[PDB]
């Protein structure tokens, strides 16, 4: 079949990531619907319902049963090109697919950059607090 780096492009792979997801039949944000919106289930001890867009890497939690995942994705990551993809996977040309995968690679890097910024900013708060505390002494 297909290389692991590329599986997330497949709806059925994405759905399969929702192992212990609480919103099932009856709910608007079921696994089928989360997956169709681009999400993968990236739960943790601390955030059991964390979902991540495989394409833009937006991360969303605090899901509720009436939440429409497509609408939540638009609300919280308006610029994600996956939302523009009207075609089925297999109807994409390799050119289109490779264009898409390049965009995702950029998104991944933008996101890692953005996380490293946040970590730096946090470390800078602690150093600042530390020096304030010591300048008083």
């Amino acid at each position: 079949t297909l290389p692991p780096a590329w599986q997330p492009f497949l709806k059925d792979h994405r759905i399969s990531t929702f192992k212990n997801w609480p919103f099932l039949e009856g709910c608007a944000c079921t696994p089928e619907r989360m997956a169709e919106a681009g999400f993968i289930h990236c739960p943790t001890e601390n955030e059991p319902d964390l979902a991540q867009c495989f394409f833009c890497f937006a991360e969303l939690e605090g899901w509720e049963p009436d939440d429409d995942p497509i609408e939540e994705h638009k609300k919280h990551s308006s610029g994600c090109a996956f939302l523009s993809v009207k075609k089925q996977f297999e109807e994409l040309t390799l050119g289109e697919f490779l264009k898409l995968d390049r965009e995702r690679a950029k998104n991944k890097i933008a996101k890692e950059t953005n996380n490293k910024k946040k970590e730096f900013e946090e470390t800078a708060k602690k150093v600042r607090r530390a020096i304030e505390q010591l300048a008083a002494m």
């Binding site: 979902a51 937006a58 969303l60 939690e61 509720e64 939540e72 919280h76």
Partner: peptide
Amino acid sequence: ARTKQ
């Protein structure tokens, strides 16, 4: 739903 922080 909402963003992680």
